Amino acid sequence: ASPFRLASAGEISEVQGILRTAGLLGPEKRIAYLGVLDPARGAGSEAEDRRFRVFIHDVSGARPQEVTVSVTNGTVISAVELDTAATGELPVLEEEFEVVEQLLATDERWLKALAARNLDVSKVRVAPLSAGVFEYAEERGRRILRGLAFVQDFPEDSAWAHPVDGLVAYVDVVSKEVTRVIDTGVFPVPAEHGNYTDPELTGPLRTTQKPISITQPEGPSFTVTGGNHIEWEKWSLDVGFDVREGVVLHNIAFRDGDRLRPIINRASIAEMVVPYGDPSPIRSWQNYFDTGEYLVGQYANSLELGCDCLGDITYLSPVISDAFGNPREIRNGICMHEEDWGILAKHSDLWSGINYTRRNRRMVISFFTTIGNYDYGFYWYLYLDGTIEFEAKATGVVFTSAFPEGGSDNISQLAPGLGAPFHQHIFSARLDMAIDGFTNRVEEEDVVRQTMGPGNERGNAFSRKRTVLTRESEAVREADARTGRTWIISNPESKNRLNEPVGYKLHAHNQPTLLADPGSSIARRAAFATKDLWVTRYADDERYPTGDFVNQHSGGAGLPSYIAQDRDIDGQDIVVWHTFGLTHFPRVEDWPIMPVDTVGFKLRPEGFFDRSPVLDVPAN
Amino acid sequence: ASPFRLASAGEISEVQGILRTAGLLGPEKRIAYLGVLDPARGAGSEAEDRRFRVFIHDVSGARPQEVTVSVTNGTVISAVELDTAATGELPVLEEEFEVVEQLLATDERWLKALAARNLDVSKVRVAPLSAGVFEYAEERGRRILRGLAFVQDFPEDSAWAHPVDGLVAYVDVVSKEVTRVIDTGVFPVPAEHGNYTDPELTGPLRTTQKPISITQPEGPSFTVTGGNHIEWEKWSLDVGFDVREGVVLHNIAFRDGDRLRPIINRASIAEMVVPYGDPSPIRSWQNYFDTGEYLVGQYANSLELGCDCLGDITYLSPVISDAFGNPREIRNGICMHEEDWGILAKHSDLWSGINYTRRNRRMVISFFTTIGNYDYGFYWYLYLDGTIEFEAKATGVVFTSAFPEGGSDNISQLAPGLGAPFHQHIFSARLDMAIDGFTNRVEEEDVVRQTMGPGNERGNAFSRKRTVLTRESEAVREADARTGRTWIISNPESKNRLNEPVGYKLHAHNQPTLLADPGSSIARRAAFATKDLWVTRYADDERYPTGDFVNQHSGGAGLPSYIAQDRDIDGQDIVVWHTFGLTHFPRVEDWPIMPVDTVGFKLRPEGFFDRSPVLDVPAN
Ligand SMILES: [Cu+2]
Ligand SMILES: [Cu+2]
Ligand code: NA
Ligand code: NA
Ligand code: NA
Ligand code: NA
C-alpha cells in the first residue's frame, strides 16, 4: 500500500501497454530510461497515483520524447518532443555498445590501421565510450560514441592487458556512419597477459585460510514489510531502486521514544564522473558519467551468497524495464544484512567500581555495478548510535594504454610497455534533508584558534564558529581540512532539552575535487565536481547535479543553473549535494585486477537527541 | 630463543633481586618504569643480552636514578642520578593518586571551600592530574599533582556528573604539602546523575537485537610461536608490550615468494597528549600526556571474551613490574583475531565471460587502557593486500565542568548546568622504517594541476610531483588535503621489476594538529603535535617525541632537539613520526557515556610488489 514501494513487473507491463496503445512504442522506438516518480510534496491526502517517467529513443532518426504515464489511471499524462542539440542526448543504450565494434570491422580506415599493426580484426575488441562535447561541429545533435581498441588473444583472455594505442574512432550510432578514424602512430601492443585466474600467474593457491563462519541462529534483527520497508534498531526507512541512480533510500527516520523523527527524506548517489588526465588526443576526451550517461542501476550484478554477501542475507530483486518495455528482474541485486561493528561504548570506573562494555552493529544495504572494466560497490550503513554513512568501493580492472618509452607525466607503468592513465572517480550524493521535519538550515563550522593574551593568558584556548548559509548564491562551499571544517544541518524550530536546535553534522573525507582546468569541457559539464558542498532549495524537477540529459550536453546544466535562482535556504525545504571522490594514480599493485579502494562520507547526530541514544542497548 | 620475546615473570624477579643486592631498592624506593631494551643495531652475532631499563623514585626526597640491568649476566650496567629540575620528573606513580585526596581532606583551606558549598568531604572525589610547567617558581624540581573535585552521592554514583567548579588545589606528593588552594567562586554542582546502568535513565533494555555468531570451526589462520611471534597470510611479526607505550610491533615483514621482505622494524604509539582549551584558571593548565606521564600500558584492561573481543580470540597476557619490582600479569590484556573484511577484488568481464570475486580479511591486534574518565582502544590491522593500518578508539566519560550561565566559547553544555570543555586527543606514531632493508628515504607527493594550453589543449591533464626530504631540517612537514598530499617511504637500492624503487605510501586523515598558541607551555612541551610528519635519522636513545622524562619538563625535549642535528636522511636508517588526532567539541550524545569515535592512519604498498599480492587467494 506504500507509495514508496518498488516498481512491480505488472506496473512495467502496464506502462508498456499504455505507451503502445498511445502509438508511442512502435518498432523503431526504444526505452532509454524508465522509472517511478516520487510522490509530490504534501501527499498527506492518500491521493495515490503511481506515475512513471520514460525517455523514448527513435532508431530511425526521429526526435526522442519524454513521456509521463499514470499506471493508476492508465493514461499518458504528457509527451514532449526533445531537441537534443539543445537539451542533451538520451542515455546510451545497451544495444548501441555492439554497434560500434561491428561498424568499425567493415570500415576501410579501421582495417588499414589494424593491418599496419598485424592485428586480426576478429580479435580486436572495441570499448564503446561516451563522446562528450569538444571541437567537432558535425557532432552537434547526433548520437556519437567513441571507440578504443584492445586485443583478445583467445575468448577467455583479458583484453585490457593489450591496448592498441595511437588509434581512436568516432561513430554515429543512428546513421551507422564512422565519422572519423584517427591514427597518431604505431605503439607496440603490450604482450604480457593479465589473466588473474591463470595458474601460471597466480601460482599455487593458498591453503592457509581457515573459514570464518558468520551466522544468526535466531534470524536477523531487522524486519522487511511491504516488499521494501525496513525497521531495524529504531531506524525506519524504505529501500528504492532506480535504473539511473541505483539504490535510493527514502524516509530515513529514527524512533526516539514515542516519536518517529525524520532525518533524511531521500538519499542517493545522483551522479558519478570518471575524468581522465592523459593529454594524448587518443584519450583526452575520455570522461565517464556512469550514472547520467550509462545508468548504473541497469548494470547491477546478481550478488552471490557467501562470496559477495556473507552472513544472514536478505535479498531484494528489483525490476527494471528493458529497451522494449518488458520487465526484467535483477535477481539478488540488493543485499541487506547486519554486521557486528566492534565496541560501541566502554568505561571502567575506579570510583564507582562499575565496568561497562557494549558492542556496536550496523545495518548494511549494498549493490554492485559493472560498467566495462570497472566494478563499483555502493554501501549504505546505519549504526546504533544514529550515524549514517556511505561508502563507495572501487575495484575491477584499470583502464590501460601503452606506456611510452621515455616515460609520462600523466600515465603510470604497470607492466612492460603497459600504462594506466591518471584519473579520478568523483561522486555526488544528493541528500534531501528532513531533520525533524522540513524546516532546515545549513551552518559551516570551523575551528577557531585564539591568540595568547588577556582572557587567554596561558594560550591554551580554542573555539569554533558557525556561519549560517542563507541563500543559494552563498551556499557553494569548499572543504578546509586544516580548520576542521564540517557542515551542520539543523532545524531552527525543533529544539533539544537544552533549548538548542537539533542537528546532524556532515563529516567529509576532504579528498581533492575535480582537477581539470576550469576552462575545460569536463569542468563545464561536471561543474558539481569542482566544489565540495552545494545547498539548494528543494524543487521537484531539480533531480540531478548534471541535469536530466547528460550525454553530449554542452555544459552548465544542473547545479550552476539551479543556484542562479538565489533562493532562501534559511529554515526551508533544502537539499544538500556533497561531492567526494578518489584521485587514482595507478600502482603496480592495482594490476592485473585491482584491490578495493574506498571513499565516502558520514553524518553524525549533533544535539539531535537529549542524551546518548544507545543507553538501552543490552550487554553480552 | 627470540631476543624480541615478551618479558617473563622470572626476568622481572631477577631484575628485582639484582637491584636489591646492589643496594638500589631499599624501603624508600619505588619502580616508576621498567621495560626491556630492544637489541642494538646489528645484533646478527647472536650475542644475546636481555637488558632492562628502570626508573627508580625515592619517596624520602633523594635524587631518583636511571638504571640499566643485564638479566643475562646478572649485573648493573649503569646507574645515573637524575637532576629532575633539569631533565624532568619521573612518571606519576599509581600510589600517588590516592595521596592527593587524602592530603586535601585534612587541609583547612580545602575544607573551608567544601563547607561553603555544603559538600561532605567524605563524598568528594579528587581527580589527581599532572601539573605541567607554568608560572609557579616554587614547583621547579618538586613532584606536583593538581586536583579537581567531583561529588559522589553514593558509592556506585558516577562522580563525573557532579563537578565542583571554581576550585583547584596543588599538592607536593613527596613532602605531603598542599602548596596552593585556589577558589575563584561558587558554582552550583550539577544535580542530574549520569548513571548509565540505572534503569530510570536507560529505560527498558531493547529486546530486538538477535545474536550474531562468529566462529572459526577449524581454528584461526594465524600461528603463535615463541610466546609472541605471529605468522598470518604471508605476514610475520613479533608482538611486544611495554608499560609506557603499550603494544609494540617488531619486525613487520611480508613473505613474497621465497623472500621474507622487511617493511617496518618497530611500530608504536610513542606519545599521546590531551590538551584542554578552556581558559578558566581552574583548568587552563590541564594537559594529559597519557603515554609519557602516566604510562598507558600499566592501566591496560583485562579483555572479556564475547564483550570486548568477539570471535575466535587468542590472548596474550603480558607481565609488568609493580612499584616494588614484583611481577604482575595483565591477564588477557591483548586480543588477537582475524576478521572478515568484505570484498577484496571483484570483476565481471563482458568480453571474457569470467566472473571473479574474492573476499578480504584482516588480522587485528588490540588492547584497551583506562586512565581516569577516558578509555582508549589501540588497534593494529594487517590486511591481505599489504596494507597496515592503525586505529585509536576513544570512549569513556568526558571530563566535565560547570556550564556558566550566559554560555561559553570554550565549553559545551551536556545537561542542565553541566559543561564539557573543548579539547583534543593527539597521538604520535613512531615508525622505525625498514622498507626492504634499512636504506630508506621519504618523498612528499602532491597532486599537480596543469593549465589548459599547448600540450594540454583540452585542459584535462593533471600530474603529481615528488620531493625527496634529504636532511632533518627540511623533514618537518604539514598536511595539505587540498593537494592530496601523501608521503612515500622507499628504498632507492631495491627496485621492482619495472626498475622503480619499492615503496609504501602513508595516508593521513588530515585532522587539525595542536590548536594552542605556539607561545604556550603545551606547545613547547608537545612540539611534536604542531606538525603532521617528522623524519629523523635512527638513534638508539631517540625513543619518544617528547623526551624520556615528560612529567613537569619545561619544554623543547624530544623531536625539536633531535632534528637540530640536521642529519642525512636520504637513503639511511630513518624513523617516521606521524602526528594525528581528534578535535573534540563534546555533543549532547556524548553524555553520560560516550559512543566510540576513531582516528588513525594507514600505509599502502606503492610499487613494493611486482603485481597484486593477492592473486593466490582462493574463492569461496
Ligand atoms: Cu581508478
Ligand atoms: Cu574527548
Ligand atoms: Na546545447
Ligand atoms: Na529537504
Ligand atoms: Na629544565
Ligand atoms: Na629505520
Contacts of A360 (CB under 8 A, 6+ apart): A340, A341, A342, A343, A344, A383, A384, A385, B595, B596
Question: What percent helix, strand, coil does chain A show, rounded to 5?
Answer: 15, 45, 45
- CA B126-B128-B132 angle, 5° bins: 140
- 8-state DSSP, A432: E
A-contacting residues in B 389-428 (Cβ below 8 Å)? 393, 395-397, 409-410, 413, 415-416, 422
What phi, psi does B538 have (nearest 5°)?
A: -60, 135
Q: Assign A256 to helix, strand or coil.
A: strand
Nine cell digits for residue B311: 570471535
The answer to whether the CB atoms of B346 and A451 lie below 8 A apart is no
- Is B537:B405 a contact under the CB 8 Å cutoff? no
- Is B587:B373 a contact under the CB 8 Å cutoff? no
B-contacting residues in A 461-480 (Cβ below 8 Å)? 461-464, 479
> Residue B328 burial by CB count (10 A; 0-12/13-18/19+): exposed, middle or buried?
middle
- Looking at the complex, does the CB of residue B613 fall below 8 Å from at least one CB of chain A? yes
Locate all alpha helices (DSSP H) within A530-581, ordered by sequence: 559-563
Q: Letter for the amino acid at A398?
A: V
Return the residue in B612, B614, B617, B620 with the most chain A beta carbons within 10 A, the one to mutate for interface testing: B612
Q: How far is A69 from chain B (nearest CA, A)?
A: 34
- Is B429:B270 a contact under the CB 8 Å cutoff? yes
Domain end marker among A195, A224, A242: A195
Cis peptide before A592 (omega within 30 of 0): yes
> Residue A218 burial by CB count (10 A; 0-12/13-18/19+): exposed, middle or buried?
exposed
Taking the centre of ligand 2 as the mean of its atom positions, its distance from the CA of residue B510, in whole angstroms, is: 18
Q: Letter for the amino acid at A267?
A: A
b/e A371-403 (16+ beta carbons within 10 angstroms → b): bbbbbbbbbbbbbbbbbbbbbbbbbbbbbbbbb
Strand extents, DSSP E, A562-593? 574-584
Q: How far is A484 from chain B (nearest CA, A)?
A: 6
Set of chain A residues whose Cβ sits within 8 Å of the Cβ of B425: none
Structural domain count of chain B:
3
Please provide the DSSP assignment of A266-329 as one string: EEEEEEEEEEB---STTTTT-EEEIIIII-GGGGBPPPPBTTTB-SS-EEE--EEE-TTS-EEE
Nine cell digits for residue B250: 617488531
CA distance linking residue B417 with residue B420, whole number of Å: 10
Q: Which of A156, A210, A422 sits opposite B221 (nearest CB)?
A: A210
Q: For residue A98, what are the domain limits?
A: 94-195
- Looking at the complex, does the CB of residue B199 fall below 8 Å from at least one CB of chain A? no
- Is B155:B133 a contact under the CB 8 Å cutoff? no
Nine cell digits for residue A411: 600515465
Nearest to A604 by CA among A436, A389, A439: A389
Separation of CA A616 from chain center: 35
Do A166 and A70 fall into the same domain? Answer: no
B-contacting residues in A 581-610 (Cβ below 8 Å)? 583, 585, 587-596, 604-610
Q: Letter for the amino acid at A51?
A: R
- 8-state DSSP, A592: S
- 8-state DSSP, B386: S
Q: Letter for the amino acid at B136?
A: Y
CA distance linking residue A244 with residue A289, whole number of Å: 11
Tell me the count of A-B CB pairs closer than 8 A: 429
Please provide the DSSP assignment of B245-272 as one string: TEEEEEEEEEEETTEEEEEEEEEEEEEE
Other C-beta atoms lying within 10 Å of the C-beta of residue B455: 8
Helix (H) or strand (E) holding B110: helix B108-116
Do A112 and A14 fall into the same domain? Answer: no
Nearest to A356 by CA among A364, A344, A348, A365: A348
Query: Would you say how long chain B is, in residues?
Result: 620
Other C-beta atoms lying within 10 Å of the C-beta of residue A436: 23
Helix (H) or strand (E) holding A115: helix A108-116
Bridge partner residues of B435 (DSSP): none
> Residue B598 burial by CB count (10 A; 0-12/13-18/19+): exposed, middle or buried?
middle
Strand extents, DSSP E, B569-616? 574-584, 594-605
What phi, psi does B197 have (nearest 5°)?
A: -105, 0
The answer to whether the CB atoms of B155 and A450 lie below 8 A apart is no
- Is A505:A486 a contact under the CB 8 Å cutoff? yes
Cis peptide before B211 (omega within 30 of 0): no
Active site residue B562: no
Bridge partner residues of B58 (DSSP): B29
Q: Assign B48 to helix, strand or coil.
A: coil
In Å, what is the CA distance from A571 to each residue of A433, A467, A471, A476? 11, 14, 11, 17
Nine cell digits for residue B206: 531493547
- Is A513:B483 a contact under the CB 8 Å cutoff? no
Q: Using alpha carbons only, how large is chain B's radius of gyration in Å?
A: 26
Do A363 and A496 fall into the same domain? Answer: yes
Nine cell digits for residue B391: 586505529
Active site residue A381: no
Contacts of A21 (CB under 8 A, 6+ apart): none
Helix (H) or strand (E) holding A342: strand A334-348
SS3 of B181-208: EEECCCCCCCCCCCCCCCHHHHCCCCCC
CA distance linking residue B51 with residue B18, whole number of Å: 12
Other C-beta atoms lying within 10 Å of the C-beta of residue B124: 23
Q: Which of A38, A157, A172, A290 is catalytic?
A: A290
Q: How far is B343 from chain A (nearest CA, A)?
A: 7
Q: Letter for the amino acid at A278?
A: D
Other C-beta atoms lying within 10 Å of the C-beta of residue A305: 12
Q: Assign B322 to helix, strand or coil.
A: coil
Q: How far is A330 from chain B (nearest CA, A)?
A: 15
Locate all alpha helices (DSSP H) within B42-107, ordered by sequence: 84-87, 94-104
- CA A242-A244-A248 angle, 5° bins: 40
Other C-beta atoms lying within 10 Å of the C-beta of residue B144: 23
Do A146 and A190 fall into the same domain? Answer: yes
**Which ligand neighbours the alpha carbon of A549 most closely?**
3
Do A57 and A81 fall into the same domain? Answer: yes
Contacts of B55 (CB under 8 A, 6+ apart): B31, B32, B33, B34, B64, B65, B66, B67, B90, B91
CA distance linking residue B105 with residue B96, whole number of Å: 15
The answer to whether the CB atoms of B218 and A212 lie below 8 A apart is no
Nine cell digits for residue B317: 597476557
Do B432 and B576 fall into the same domain? Answer: yes
Nearest residue of chain A to residue B374 (CA atoms): A347
Do B41 and B177 fall into the same domain? Answer: no
Bridge partner residues of B309 (DSSP): B305
Strand duo B319-321 + B355-371: pairing: unpaired
Taking the centre of ligand 4 as the mean of its atom positions, its distance from the CA of residue A575, in whole angstroms, is: 5
- Looking at the complex, does the CB of residue B443 fall below 8 Å from at least one CB of chain A? no
Nine cell digits for residue B326: 614484583
Nearest to B7 by CA among B332, B339, B258, B240: B240
Which method resolved this structure? X-ray
Please provide the DSSP assignment of B494-545 as one string: EE-TTS-EEEEEEEE-------S-TTSHHHHHTGGGGSSEEEEE--TT---T
Cis peptide before B39 (omega within 30 of 0): no
First to last CA, chain B: 38
Long-range contacts from A284-288, C-beta under 8 angstroms, 24+ separation: A284/B457, A284/B458, A284/B460, A284/B461, A285/A131, A285/A132, A285/A134, A285/A146, A285/B458, A286/A129, A286/A146, A286/A399, A286/A421, A287/A130, A287/A132, A287/A522, A287/A525, A287/A526, A287/B460, A288/A129, A288/A130, A288/A371
Nine cell digits for residue B321: 613490574
B292 is known to lie in a ligand binding site: yes
CA distance linking residue A305 with residue A314, whole number of Å: 10
Bridge partner residues of A419 (DSSP): A401, A413
Do B323 and B283 fall into the same domain? Answer: yes
Do A566 and A480 fall into the same domain? Answer: yes
Domain end marker among B195, B228, B261: B195
The answer to whether the CB atoms of A450 and B220 lie below 8 A apart is no
Q: Which of A455, A587, A592 sits opposite B279 (nearest CB)?
A: A455
Cell 576501410, residue located: A108
Bridge partner residues of A359 (DSSP): A343
Nine cell digits for residue A522: 569536463
Do B169 and B233 fall into the same domain? Answer: no
> Residue A225 burial by CB count (10 A; 0-12/13-18/19+): exposed, middle or buried?
exposed
Helix (H) or strand (E) holding A340: strand A334-348
CA distance linking residue B342 with residue B362, whole number of Å: 10
What phi, psi does B113 have (nearest 5°)?
A: -70, -40
> Residue B8 burial by CB count (10 A; 0-12/13-18/19+): exposed, middle or buried?
middle
Nearest residue of chain A to residue B461 (CA atoms): A277
The CATH number linked to A234 is 2.70.98.20
Contacts of A112 (CB under 8 A, 6+ apart): none
**Torsion on CA atoms B486, B491, B494, B495, rounded to nearest 10:** 20
CA distance linking residue A82 with residue A552, whole number of Å: 14
A276 is known to lie in a ligand binding site: no
CA distance linking residue B494 with residue B357, whole number of Å: 32
CA distance linking residue B50 with residue A540, whole number of Å: 74
Q: Which of B165, B290, B432, B590 is catalytic?
A: B290
Bridge partner residues of A463 (DSSP): A448
The answer to whether the CB atoms of B590 and A612 lie below 8 A apart is yes
Domain end marker among A195, A226, A248: A195
Q: How far is B211 from chain A (nearest CA, A)?
A: 6
Nine cell digits for residue B398: 568526558
Separation of CA B27 from chain center: 32
Do B437 and B562 fall into the same domain? Answer: yes
Contacts of A198 (CB under 8 A, 6+ apart): none
CA distance linking residue B349 with residue A158, whole number of Å: 8
Nearest to B346 by CA among A245, A365, A367, A94: A367
B186 is known to lie in a ligand binding site: no
The CATH number linked to A163 is 3.10.450.40
Nearest to A498 by CA among A611, A380, A616, A614: A611
The answer to whether the CB atoms of B447 and A515 lie below 8 A apart is yes
Query: Would you say how long chain A is, in residues?
Result: 620
- Looking at the complex, does the CB of residue A218 fall below 8 Å from at least one CB of chain B? yes
Other C-beta atoms lying within 10 Å of the C-beta of residue B344: 20
CA distance linking residue A519 with residue B6, whole number of Å: 61
Contacts of A67 (CB under 8 A, 6+ apart): A19, A24, A53, A54, A55, A56, A76, A78, A79, A80
First to last CA, chain A: 38
Contacts of B68 (CB under 8 A, 6+ apart): B37, B51, B52, B53, B54, B76, B77, B78, B79
SS3 of A35-102: EECCCCCCCCCCCCCCEEEEEEEECCCCCCEEEEEECCCCEEEEEEECCHHHHCCCCCCHHHHHHHHH
Do B182 and B264 fall into the same domain? Answer: no
